[PDB]
Design an enzyme around this catalytic site. Structure first.
Site, PDB file in Angstrom:
ATOM      1  CD  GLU B  12      -2.893  -1.446   2.173  1.00  0.00           C
ATOM      2  OE1 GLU B  12      -2.440  -1.157   3.298  1.00  0.00           O
ATOM      3  OE2 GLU B  12      -3.999  -2.009   2.006  1.00  0.00           O
ATOM      4  CG  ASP B 197     -12.162  -8.262   0.134  1.00  0.00           C
ATOM      5  OD1 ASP B 197     -13.082  -8.397   0.969  1.00  0.00           O
ATOM      6  OD2 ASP B 197     -11.093  -7.660   0.378  1.00  0.00           O
TER       7      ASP B 197
END
Ligand SMILES: Nc1ncnc2c([C@@H]3O[C@H](CO)[C@@H](O)[C@H]3O)n[nH]c12
Ligand SMILES: Nc1ncnc2c([C@@H]3O[C@H](CO)[C@@H](O)[C@H]3O)n[nH]c12
Lengths: 229, 229
Positions: B12, B197
């Protein structure tokens, strides 16, 4: 020498402040109030974090970074998971786990986060001191694993999970996070708990009844440790 | 000024470091490595916390106390709880909750801890900046409640609880704790997530497939915000 003393709740540090009996300066920071005092040759910094992992993580980090404490002693109450830990009994945590950590979706063991470990250890030196004092004072101090999470456990099924999954002897909501922070900064930590309840269906009522006394039992013992430091 | 920039995982923050493209000094503290750089007369401090509430609480507190950051922007991925938030979509958190906090034994609402609150708010000014940039760039930025906890959610049953109990739009493992620390210290905080997700039975697989892409989507937007600061 600078010593940090932590509890989770006001009830857990009131006996501590009283036992030291010195003047304390109140210093606000990060939503906590730190009580700074001089006790003999030691500077003591006392605070309650408020309940749970995030709260206790923040307060311990502030104590270390903002006040430069060289040791952290935590005192408070916990739920018993094993028969020979009775109400008011004292336990010193030798290892701690975060029992509510769950990355099993990725087939990690419960309690595990990548780049971390399941179990955190506490200070061998402080734990030995605790055991020495307990032996000398004829106090029945137990040792073992403490499971920490952000739920107040009041269920037989959860108790069984904690013992079977992590071999825990007691359950609370701050120990593992305080010890984790201390380890990351290289600061010795001792976690002391006195049993307030049996982490079962009526644990809330038992906690309400015994919080004050159990908190005092922990505080008095923590005070005796500081007297030897 | 001094700007803190945070992710939970290496994946990230690598895009963030590359995007700024300056030389960073690496500074270890509290088990984290902070990357300190200068970018157009702004000092930027970038780190990943490692996963979860304790990790992210520690890192955010260190960023504020040790580096003196004046604002914190968090970038990472999350699971969607609602149909209109699709994989790769961007969400700015308007409020956050710790969905795994449970003191119901004392009759407290779920998510509540005494001396705190269920919901934490984020920066009005930063969120408005995010919305202006999205509008200007014709990006479909969503806003909503984010639920944070120490479990990777991969269960329709848990999704239903989160939406019903907290009105959450997405779920992750750091947002609420980062914003909590920021609020306690009076530091403006923005939490951005890109969906990786659907927080369901196949979430682990989806996360594995989309972590990198979604992480890049969030990083690029965060960079756009810093460019306007
Ligand atoms: N059965 C139990 N489950 C979880 N925590 C506790 C505690 C401790 O008391 C407080 C209960 O919210 C909290 O600080 C926790 O550390 N006592 N009994 C407990
Ligand atoms: N369905 C889900 N449930 C919880 N967390 C996450 C995440 C985020 O990705 C990491 C998953 O471990 C963690 O940092 C969390 O914030 N993605 N999808 C998630």
């Amino acid at each position: 020498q600078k010593i940090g003393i932590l509890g989770a709740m006001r009830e857990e540090i009131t006996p501590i402040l009283e036992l030291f009996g010195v003047d304390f300066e109140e210093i606000p920071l990060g939503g906590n109030v730190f009580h700074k005092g001089v006790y003999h040759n030691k500077e003591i910094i006392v605070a309650y974090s408020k309940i749970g992992k995030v709260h206790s993580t923040l307060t311990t980090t502030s104590m270390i970074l903002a006040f430069g404490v060289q040791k952290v002693l935590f005192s408070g109450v916990a739920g018993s998971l094993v028969k020979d830990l009775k109400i008011n009994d004292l336990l010193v945590a030798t290892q701690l786990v975060q029992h509510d950590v769950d990355l099993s979706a990725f087939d990690h063991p419960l309690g595990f986060i990548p780049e971390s470990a399941i179990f955190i250890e506490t200070s061998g030196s402080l734990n030995a001191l605790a055991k020495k004092i307990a032996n000398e004072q004829h106090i029945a101090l137990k040792e073992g694993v403490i499971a920490s999470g952000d739920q107040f456990v009041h269920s037989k099924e959860r108790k069984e999970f904690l013992v079977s999954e992590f071999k825990a002897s007691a359950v609370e909501m701050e120990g593992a996070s305080v010890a984790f922070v201390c380890q990351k900064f290289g600061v010795p930590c001792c976690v002391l708990r006195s049993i307030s309840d049996n982490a079962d269906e009526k644990a809330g009522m038992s906690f309400d009844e015994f919080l004050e006394k159990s908190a005092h039992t922990s505080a008095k013992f923590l005070k005796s440790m500081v007297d030897e430091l």
